Amino acid sequence: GLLRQTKLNIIGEDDIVKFRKTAVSFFRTTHSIPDSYGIVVKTPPGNIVHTGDFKFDFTPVGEPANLTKMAEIGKEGVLCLLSDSTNSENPEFTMSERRVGESIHDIFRKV
Amino acid sequence: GLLRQTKLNIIGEDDIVKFRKTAVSFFRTTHSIPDSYGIVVKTPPGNIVHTGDFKFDFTPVGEPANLTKMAEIGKEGVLCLLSDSTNSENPEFTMSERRVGESIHDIFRKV
């Protein structure tokens, strides 16, 4: 029911939302759902970065994670990073969705 | 014998050598020998990039590959890339020298 009375905003890669002493920017990541962003909260004492949930996929189905922009963010300086820990026990590099897609198509030919 | 009559120059991360219509810059990479650089040759029609020989190691023994600078180089625009093909048949991610060091120390305790 609360749809009527809440202010829903849609942002994209390039939007910056500024407040008195604080600003919020975005950078695209890859995850198990489309359209995922990480976040940079700029504050006077320095910049805070939130990875959202992320993997790396160099052959993704969607829009490729913005590595260029992540590198810039680090150069510009970063006070603190909040990074997704969920899969940290696994040493291996995550298989690309491209590979499962291939596996899907293969099943469709054999069955 | 040819040491006497050749001009040996030593460069570092931050050196640029300029010529009439062409300039040469450098970025640090990781490889099986220390002090390895990739190269950016700037020319009017666009920029050419040479990877040297490279792997990625996020826990290297030496100076870490300059990812920030690689990202910048791509942003600045790149006409053509000459990239090291040698290990391109292997899908896996290269084990870090940090891990072999660990394995070396382990041998030294057991033997």
Query: What is the DSSP secondary structure assignment for residue A55, as one 8-state letter?
Result: B
Alpha-carbon distance A63 to A40, whole Å?
A: 19
CA distances (Å), origin A59, targets A38, A97, B72: 19, 8, 21
Which residues 56-95 of A have a C-beta within 8 angstroms of B? Answer: 67-68, 70-72, 74-75, 92-93
Please give the Cα distance from B69 to A105 (Å, whole number). Answer: 39
Determine the Cα–Cα distance for residues B49 and B69; give it in Å rounded to an integer. 12
- Kindly list the residues from chain B whose CB atom is less than 8 angstroms away from the CB atom of residue A70: 71
Displacement of CA B5 from its chain's centroid (Å): 28
Residues of chain A neighbouring B72 (CB-CB closer than 8 A): 71-72, 75
Q: Give A-chain residues touching B92 at CB under 8 angstroms.
A: 93
The C-alpha atoms of residue B4 and residue B81 are separated, in whole angstroms, by: 35
Alpha helices in chain B (DSSP H): 67-75, 97-110
Each residue of B46-69: b (16+ CB within 10 Å) or e? Answer: ebbbebbebbebeebeeeebbbeb
Q: How was this structure determined?
A: X-ray
Known catalytic residue: B35?
Answer: no
Strands B46-50 and B80-82: parallel
Q: State yes or no: B35 annotated in a binding site.
A: no
